[PDB]
Structures are given as structure tokens and as C-alpha cells.
Design a protein around this ligand. Structure first.
Ligand SMILES: Nc1ncnc2c1ncn2[C@@H]1O[C@H](COP(=O)(O)OP(=O)(O)OP(=O)(O)O)[C@@H](O)[C@H]1O
Lengths: 98, 147, 295, 147
């Protein structure tokens, strides 16, 4: 039940507790088999997202995790960095001629 | 949305390489990216669809099949291009700053020495020239004109 | 050039200038024109000469330079010379033991205002090679984005008391004390990138033994050319006026509009330097000065 | 044999993915496959070159660059196609049973809807039409005729 806890800080510590390779296994089959033990019905509304969060985060350490999916771009072209506003705003909130 | 599974994607595990076919996620992720009223869900559904249409272009360009029928993923392109327009000129400014450049970026790629003759561009053209018609949106038509 | 084909009632045109004194000819084995082609481009340098293409009866390309308005009489005569220099070089022990020869090439002065000057295929000019060793970040220093001239030179003329681009050199030689001109020249010579030609041959080479050899032949062939160019007083040694013979890796000295001292005779910008031993060659030999294998 | 390294090949390790550029091995492996007098060396040098020209075709067909100059690996193709002929009609029957089918297999692929216009096929054609000329071999010319 601490794995649905209201404070995101405690929600993270208990996730990080079960993720450890001694509490809950590292090979994918025994991980998939073991996750069925991480249930009681008081967790059910969240369970599917937790089981998948424990399987895909086993890839956080995988040798391909930082490789590119396709080796090189579509043709000769050049690329840049970028930034998105992401702070205080939805578009429909400031008047036109100002 | 397709007769047979495109997007076969091998999950990066250390023991093994199990396969997900990503073309099952689109019918729900497209609806989330437009219509999710919770803003934090919405933007995360966008960046999944962005990374998933990057995956799309790459997988098609390896030539999984080279024509001799419906080009691979034409049936996806016909279904995802109208979503990409409706979702550039979305209201949410974090969504707009992500997809206005991406549609112009796609529109550059879909004019090219081989690909200008492709039905990928026919699907694209007829998506945008249905975009300008829309009977219930004023800002979609402006964007599709600029497209 | 569209209308020319192989047909009767025409003397079939053998490829221009292919006849030479090296043994009995076997004349019918010489290439002859099948036709010209629907392709052309113009060279960048000031007389805008033209990379014409001929197809021979051999079903083979002869990319060629048309040059003209300039009279190729001078250019032919500066090659007779180079052929006899290959002559003595093959015929004394001090140079046969070193395998020393220039490359000459075929001029043919097709009229008083033309020639079909042979293009050496699989070759590139030394300025093209130099820029082709740079990244986009050092290339910025020739796109002239950091300063309006590639090195400061054209603007630094004002510190050197020269204002305009052309002829302003005619003033600097007045007050150009050794200390200010050396120290400012050394500041520019130390601006422009290290190890460019070392990078060119590392890119060409399979492995350290192949690099050491390739290095030596570039510097050897370069050395022999720059003395023989001096011997006949040639000038305007501009970096388009050399090619790397990119297969063998040797230098070729490309052209001679200013032969026989006539480079330094012509007034408006005098050429003091007798020939070329610049920085990226000294940097090619780095651990030893030009007093090694070049000398 | 090339201005810049093609064939960048990531060795399958478990910790890591170090890269070998295979185009350094060809100048010696080609000489072994023809000219090795020890027969056991010879056949093993062939099956390396076979697997290495399979690697070649695949890596080019991912389109590492799409023209705009010398096609990638044209400079390899110009140097390896004449070796492939000389080595189909080699004497050694184990070599011949491996490369006669492979050259005909290449010759099929190098006629195709895109690739029939490619300089890959110009290099191929002028390799074979130098093959029929050979001034010191009677069986090479017969093969190049049948090619
Ligand atoms: N043999 C050659 N092979 C390849 N390129 C050549 C050859 N000879 C000359 N060129 C090209 O021709 C261009 C100019 O013509 P050329 O060098 O023959 O006469 P030039 O009087 O020196 O011309 P310019 O002064 O304008 O450079 C050169 O800059 C070079 O690009």
C-alpha cells in the first residue's frame, strides 16, 4: 500500500525499494513472474501502471537504452537544440494588439 | 487501422528482445493527445505520438516493403496525417510549439527526388486539402492554407 | 558540338596532341573522337575556362580543359622544357637513384586563342584539398564570419598603413620594419589551423608505413617542382595552381600564364618570393625544418 | 581503397558495442582468397569475403548516404567486382560452387526498377566487359560472356 502513497517523495522511495535487484529479481521472466506477488486489491486501480513501470525500468540499465533507433538521418541535413515555453500559459489568454 | 502489423519494435532488454507492435497504441494515443482535458496527460500523450511518428518515418525508410501494392504504412499515414494537423493548431501552447514545426518538417520531406511521386504525398495532400474545408473550425483552415 | 558524329566524307579526328616522340607511334591505336556530350561546367578562376567532355571511339571519357583568349604558345613552350627536364633527371645517377621526374601533361594550341589542355582524372587542387580537410567550425574562418577577411589581412592593411584592397601593398614596403611586420605576420600565421596537411595524408593512408611513404613522395615531388619552376622564373603560385595527384599523392604544378620571370616583371603588385615553402608544408615536416628532405 | 570509412560494424559484445571498419580487411582478404596456395586458408578467406560482401550490399541498402556524389561504396564495388569474377571460375571446386551462383545473384539484383540506372551497375558492366578481354586467361572470358 505504500506504493500508492499520497506524497510523491514517499511514492518514489517505496518504488525504488521494490525495484532493487535483491527484493524483486533482475532477469525478465522471474521479474514478470514475481510481480504477481506485488498485489492486494487496495492497489488495483494503479496496478497495471506499476507492473509496467517495474518491467520497462529494468531497461533503464540496458546496453541499447542510449543507442539511436536508426543509425544516421533521412539525407544530408543539419540539426539544432530547441526550447518550449511550458510555464504559465495556454494560447487563448492575452489580447491581440498589445 | 491496418491489415497486418507494421511498427514491429524490439524492446531493449538485457536477457532478450521481445517484440511490441506499436500500431495498437495509436487509436487511443491519438484520442488522448487531442481530447485529454487533464493537461499533464495531454502533453505526455503528445510526446509519445511525436516519438512514435519519428519511429514511423524511420521504419518505412528502411523499406520494410518497397511498393508493389499499398506502400507499407500508407494506411497509417492516411489515418495519422489529419490528426497531426488538428493537433498543431491545438490551443495548448506546449502542444503547438511541438507540432507546427513537425508538420512543416514532414511537408519538406514529402517533397523529394524519389518521394514526390509517392502516394505518401497523395495521402498527405488530400489530408491537408480536407483540412482547409473543415465545417466546424476557423483556425484549422488558416493553418492548412499556410501548409 | 551536337552535329559532330563518326561519318564518311570526314577525316576521323584522332584525339588532339596524342602524338609524341616516345617510340614509333602505332597511329591507328590512338584514340579518335566519337562525339561531344550534353554536359558542361565553368572553372572558378578569372578566365572562366571550361571542363568540356569528349567521348572517344574507345567508348571512354576524355574530360578536358578548354582554355582560350590566352595563347597556349607560351604554355606549350613551358612544357617542352619540362619534358627535357624529365630527360636529364632520368639520365643522371643523383636523380635516377631517387626516382625523380616531374609530371608534364599535354597542351595543344588548337588556335592562337585555344587549347584542349588534358584534365588529369582522380586529382583535386591544393586549396580544394585544404578546405576539404577543415570542419565547418574552421571553415567559418574562410566563410569570413569571425572577421570580414579570412585571416585579418585585408583590414589589418590599415595598421600596415594600406587602405584599399588592390595596390595598397605598394605603400607597406615603405615603413615595414622587420619587428612590426614579422610580429603581426606571426600572429596571423599562428591563427590558422595546425596539422591540416598532416590530416590530409592520415585520411589518405591505410596505416603508418603507407603514411610515411605517401608523405615523402608529396614532399619530394613538391620539392622538385618548386626548384624547376624557380629555374624558369614562373610565379603566381596561387593554391589553385597546384594539384594533388590523388591516387599517387604527388604534386603537379598546373599553369604558366606568367612564365620566364614575367610574374615579377609585371608592376602593380610585385612578387618578391621566388617560389613556395609555406606553413602547412613546414607543418607537414614538423619535427624537422625544411632543411630536411625538401632541402 | 576509399576516401572515408564505409562498413562501420559494431562487434556484438555484452558490456559494450566497439566498432570495426571492415574496409581495412579487403586488400589482404581478396589476395588470400585468390592466391593462397594452402587450400584450408583459401576457402576460409572466401567465406569471409562472401559474408563481407553480404554485409556490403545490406549496409549500402540502408542508404548510409543516397547519392549526391559518388554513391557510397561505389569505390569498393569498382575494386571488388573484378575480384568476384576472377574467383568464380577459380580452379578450386569448393570456391566455384560458392561464387558462380553469387555473381549471377548479384547480376539479377543489379537490374531493378531503381537500381538499373545506378553507377553500381555501370561499375558492374565495365568490370565484366573488362573481364571478357583478359589477355592471360581462357576460362575467365567464357564466364564473363555467360555473365
Ligand atoms: N590539367 C588540369 N587538370 C585539372 N584541372 C586543371 C588542369 N589545368 C588547369 N586546370 C583548371 O583550370 C583552371 C584555370 O585555367 P588554367 O590553370 O589552365 O589557366 P590559368 O591562366 O592559370 O587560369 P587562371 O589564372 O584563371 O587560374 C584552374 O584554376 C584549374 O581549376
Amino acid at each position: 500500500q505504500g506504493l500508492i502513497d499520497e506524497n510523491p517523495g514517499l511514492q518514489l522511495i517505496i518504488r525504488n525499494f521494490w525495484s532493487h535487484e535483491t527484493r524483486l529479481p533482475s532477469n525478465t521472466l522471474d521479474r514478470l513472474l514475481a510481480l504477481n506477488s506485488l498485489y492486494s486489491p487496495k492497489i488495483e486501480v494503479h496496478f497495471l501502471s506499476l507492473a509496467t513501470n517495474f518491467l520497462l525500468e529494468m531497461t533503464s540499465m540496458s546496453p541499447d537504452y542510449p543507442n539511436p533507433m536508426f543509425e544516421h538521418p533521412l539525407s544530408e541535413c543539419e540539426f539544432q537544440e530547441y526550447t518550449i515555453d511550458s510555464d504559465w500559459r495556454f494560447r487563448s489568454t492575452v489580447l491581440t494588439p498589445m | 487501422w491496418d491489415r497486418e502489423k507494421r511498427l514491429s519494435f524490439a524492446v531493449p532488454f538485457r536477457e532478450m528482445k521481445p517484440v511490441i507492435f506499436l500500431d495498437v497504441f495509436l487509436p487511443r494515443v491519438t484520442e488522448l493527445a487531442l481530447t485529454a482535458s487533464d493537461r499533464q496527460t495531454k502533453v505526455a500523450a503528445c510526446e509519445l505520438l511525436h516519438s512514435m511518428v519519428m519511429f514511423m518515418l524511420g521504419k518505412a525508410t528502411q523499406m520494410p516493403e518497397g511498393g508493389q501494392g499499398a506502400p507499407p504504412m500508407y494506411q497509417l499515414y492516411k489515418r495519422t496525417f489529419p490528426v497531426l494537423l488538428r493537433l498543431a493548431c491545438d490551443v495548448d501552447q506546449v502542444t503547438r510549439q511541438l507540432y507546427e514545426p513537425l508538420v512543416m518538417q514532414l511537408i519538406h520531406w514529402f517533397t523529394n527526388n524519389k518521394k514526390f511521386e509517392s502516394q505518401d504525398t497523395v495521402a498527405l495532400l488530400e489530408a491537408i486539402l480536407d483540412g482547409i474545408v473543415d465545417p466546424v473550425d476557423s483556425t484549422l483552415r488558416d493553418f492548412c492554407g499556410r501548409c | 558540338m551536337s552535329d559532330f558524329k563518326v561519318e564518311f566524307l570526314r577525316n576521323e579526328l584522332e584525339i588532339p596532341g596524342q602524338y609524341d616522340g616516345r617510340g614509333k607511334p602505332l597511329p591507328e591505336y590512338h584514340v579518335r573522337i566519337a562525339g561531344f556530350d550534353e554536359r558542361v561546367t565553368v572553372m572558378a578562376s578569372l578566365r572562366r575556362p571550361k571542363r568540356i567532355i569528349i567521348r572517344g571511339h574507345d567508348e571512354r571519357e576524355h574530360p578536358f580543359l578548354v582554355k582560350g583568349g590566352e595563347d597556349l604558345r607560351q604554355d606549350q613552350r613551358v612544357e617542352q622544357l619540362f619534358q627535357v627536364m624529365n630527360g636529364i633527371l632520368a639520365q643522371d645517377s643523383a636523380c635516377s637513384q631517387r626516382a625523380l621526374q616531374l609530371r608534364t601533361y599535354s597542351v595543344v594550341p588548337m588556335t592562337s586563342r585555344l587549347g584542349l589542355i588534358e584534365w588529369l582524372e582522380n586529382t583535386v587542387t591544393l586549396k580544394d584539398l585544404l578546405l576539404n580537410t577543415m570542419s565547418q567550425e574552421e571553415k567559418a574562418a574562410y566563410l569570413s564570419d569571425p572577421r570580414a577577411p579570412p585571416c585579418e589581412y585585408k583590414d589589418w592593411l590599415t595598421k600596415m598603413s594600406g587602405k584599399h584592397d588592390v595596390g595598397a601593398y605598394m605603400l607597406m614596403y615603405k615603413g615595414a620594419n622587420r619587428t612590426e611586420t614579422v610580429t603581426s605576420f606571426r600572429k596571423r600565421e599562428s591563427k590558422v589551423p595546425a596539422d591540416l596537411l598532416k590530416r590530409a595524408f592520415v585520411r589518405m593512408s591505410t596505416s603508418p608505413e603507407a603514411f610515411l611513404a605517401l608523405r615523402s613522395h608529396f614532399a619530394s615531388s613538391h620539392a622538385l617542382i618548386c626548384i624547376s619552376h624557380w629555374i624558369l622564373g614562373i610565379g603566381d603560385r596561387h593554391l589553385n595552381n597546384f594539384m594533388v595527384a590523388m591516387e599517387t599523392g604527388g604534386v603537379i604544378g598546373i599553369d604558366f600564364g606568367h612564365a620566364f620571370g614575367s610574374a615579377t616583371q609585371f608592376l602593380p603588385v610585385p612578387e618578391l618570393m621566388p617560389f613556395r615553402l609555406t606553413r602547412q608544408f613546414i607543418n607537414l615536416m614538423l619535427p624537422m625544418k625544411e632543411t630536411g628532405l625538401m632541402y
